[PDB]
Amino acid sequence: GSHMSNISLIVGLGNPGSEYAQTRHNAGFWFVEQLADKYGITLKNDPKFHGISGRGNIEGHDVRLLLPMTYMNRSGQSVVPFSKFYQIAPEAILIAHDELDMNPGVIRLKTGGGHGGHNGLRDIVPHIGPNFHRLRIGIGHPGSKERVSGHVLGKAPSNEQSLMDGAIDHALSKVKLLVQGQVPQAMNQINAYKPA
């Protein structure tokens, strides 16, 4: 299984299909797909766990990657059995997700806390508890609550997309610290990011 707070499972949240791939709610997929390409980790079909997954070496550590293919609000149907099967404790899990409560171009690493309204986290925390790490990728808020679906299922304008892409790129450079268990240093260096 996992070992302490070395990160050994990195999950990206999102919805499946081309119609959702460019939407804000897929920010976690963007991160994990880019990470997989950086390290040469194959993301392959994983029907057993209702997702796409991979396994490979990140900086001398054996790490698994997971993209649930359940639709966002059923993400736990992938993350929970996968983590349990591989004996990965929540403390060794990083979940990358879009964050309505932060601006595009802001990115933060957080440990613990609730779902903050996020319908994918809402499907995970009841089962494994809150004590996993989160890479909160700011996407902005549409103002009102009635609008949240339309915002998160929208494709950001180019300025916002550029800001998010830069923040994601910065976080990819800090995965080495996470897989090494240097969560405090990673948190400081991720949370310090600014776009300009």
What residue numbers does the annotated binding site cover? Answer: 20, 71, 73, 119
97 counts as binding Cl ion under rule CB under 5 A? no
Nearer to Cl ion, 44 or 145 (CB): 145
Check 25, 50, 118, 151 and give the catalytic one: 25
Nearer to Cl ion, 16 or 181 (CB): 16
Q: Show contacts with Cl ion in window 34-73 (CB under 5 A).
A: 72
Q: Show contacts with Na ion in window 77-116 (CB under 5 A).
A: 77, 92, 104-105
Q: How far is the CB of 10 from Cl ion (least distance, A)?
A: 18
Q: How far is the CB of 96 from Na ion (least distance, A)?
A: 10
185 counts as binding Na ion under rule CB under 5 A? yes
Active site residue 25: yes
Question: Can you tell me which of 10, 68, 83, 133 binds Na ion, judged by CB under 5 A?
Answer: 68
Distance CA(121)–CA(168), nearest Å, equals 19
Catalytic residues: 25
